[PDB]
Amino acid sequence: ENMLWHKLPKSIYFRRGSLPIALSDLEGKKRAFLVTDRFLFNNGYADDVVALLKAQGMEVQTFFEVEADPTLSVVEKGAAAMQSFQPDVILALGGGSPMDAAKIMWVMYEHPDTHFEELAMRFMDIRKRIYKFPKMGKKAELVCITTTSGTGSEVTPFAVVTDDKTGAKYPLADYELTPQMAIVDANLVMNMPKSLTAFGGYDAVTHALEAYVSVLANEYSDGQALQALKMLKEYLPSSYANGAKDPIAREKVHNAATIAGIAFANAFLGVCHSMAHKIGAEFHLPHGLANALLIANVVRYNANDNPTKQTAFSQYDRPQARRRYAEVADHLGLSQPGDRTAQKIERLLTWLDELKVNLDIPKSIQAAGVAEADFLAKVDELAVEAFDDQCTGANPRYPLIAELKEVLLASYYGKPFVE
């Protein structure tokens, strides 16, 4: 048989006005380094943290020179600056790139002798526990602050870094990348605008929905996945409509995002995540809504009775995805008491349809402002390059590149995918 997982960072401090009491316990430490973004650095947020540090008085410096993506260039200039400083504490601020880049630079600082490529190709995925990783955290060590509701990078031991010369994407993933320390306060995220709220919320929603039906879904993930899913359905529309006039829904959905981040940190992601990643990469589309336009077709792709064409090991652990969707729907009260599976599924995806309507997103990729000429030009290699992007992937039914383009064109055009 096989084995399976649940590993989390040790400590989370998380609320409304938690930040000062959160950082209070950081007395005995002396040095520090800060990573953040230039925009937030301009905003009156970094001053807050540096003042609270000077309250004890810490040799500190901020790095606000991270852009939307890890660079394989910014990472080592930051690592070199800090190893010149040699701090023992590292603080990450924001969402996505500032955090994982920090991770990278920190681990680069941890062993300033190991080169990048052997690390990059040695560690792509998990259950490949061959063989070992150099010890980290011996001299510096990681505390994390989220700002955006909708991403779980604060907790997952994941990173992806891009070549500047070729734009090559490098996924690095193994459990030591989890920060020791996580903080989830909401005062930072009260004025954030729509539909950026919608963007993050739908990103996290995708994460949870793929996590539950993942083939790696342990008994441990399902509870908090369904809890985040249950809580989202009442406080996303209010928070999208109301805020910061609604200081109830916003922090709550922030917590949902954190819960999802906890959830899929063990039950890995699926194909739709990879294709959203790519499509956003080429067309400069943000994540969070790139996947959102996909999921309907995705589930219509996944929801099948018994096509034993590329399914594997079908009958040992995964009973059926359709059953899983029906359980979610009826558990969500999204089904008439006397119902079959299929109509429960129908109600479920109709629910998410009217949901995404409520949060003001388009219905097709062309409706998003995407030309069809370059779309058809690039979709051929898009589907192929998406076939392999770590997706692989807890996807129960194996895909073939042919189906991918069909889904892609359906997405570009609308059109409920029913056979």
Partner: protein, 446 residues
Amino acid sequence: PVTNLAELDALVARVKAAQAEFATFSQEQVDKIFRAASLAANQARIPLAQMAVEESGMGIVEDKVIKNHFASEFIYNKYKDEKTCGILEEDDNLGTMTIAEPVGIICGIVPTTNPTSTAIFKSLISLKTRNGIIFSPHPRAKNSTNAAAKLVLDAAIAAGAPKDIIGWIDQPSVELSNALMKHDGIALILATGGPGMVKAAYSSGKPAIGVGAGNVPVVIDETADIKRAVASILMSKTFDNGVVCASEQAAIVVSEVYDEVKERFATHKAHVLSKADADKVRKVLLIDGALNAKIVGQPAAAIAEMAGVKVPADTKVLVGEGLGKVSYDDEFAHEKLSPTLGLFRADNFEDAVAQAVTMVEIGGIGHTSGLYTNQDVNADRIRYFGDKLKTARILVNIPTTHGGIGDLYNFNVAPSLTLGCGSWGGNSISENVGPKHLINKKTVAK
């Protein structure tokens, strides 16, 4: 451009001087080339897979994509960091020093079944061992192989590699392949695929090892669960129209659990066959006595109609039961390399064992063997089964393929390829290949 023997010997001398200078390189610098080449190879798996599919004319793109990924990742990971340059072991107190040194020039023969994966495999291992290689691609699936060779060569070039180390034919011909096979300047030859070429490469008066496979039998007894065996065998056989090496070729079913297994195939895409269409397909499997090539990697419907029969389009494998006779003349007894299967009707466990043995000598290579049985109640069966069989791999309740849920089924197995032997005669248990076969060691005593 390489089409005649003149330019052939020209690039022979060229890559000879190239390897001569390449073999003086230090470990710490060949390592980064190793990493860069492995990464670049693992990047563009799909353009190569599409190229191979279109050039071959058959196969499944995604199987080739996934096997490219698995090949590149596994070959890099298992051979990340190994001491291969300079001194290897030392006894200073005795002054006895043992170093290694590369071999030189090797030829590589590429079949159409796996034209691109084997290419990157051999290329990366050669480059790791500071040696040179020339390719004999098959004329059918060649342009994909050549394109992969240029891509990996260029990725090496942008790493400080010499001007080239890689040679290959253009428009490959039997005369050029024989001229290079008997060329003086080559040190080793690596032949894989059809049995006709491997014996000729053996009959070369030169070092040679051939990675091949024979008829892979699986025996299923009564204490076996039917469903798990059926599902596993169907997934393994359906992988890429059964073109993977060391794939299943005949099934042994014991008496008591026979007809329910047969109807179990009837309950799925397996299309049973017991009539003159067994002959209609026996003709087309074995047209010349030498494995008719018009069925290579072809779907069940296509092979059924070319046999002369209609079959429901959803079917994937054709099940032959006219296999009461056990000998070479049985077309089913030969390996099929296609989504086709012939089964046996065994009497008991030991009749099944004898039939399995009678299968295994036909291949001539002891490569793999399958047992589908209850595990914890019959360990006597397990060890006796191991005693009677002589194959490199013994699997119990395990598919003879790669990839189930999660990591890999099984995660701790080498590919069905890479298992070759230095002989062909009989019971030649195929063995995996490593740089120990590809580097010569010398020692000095003081």
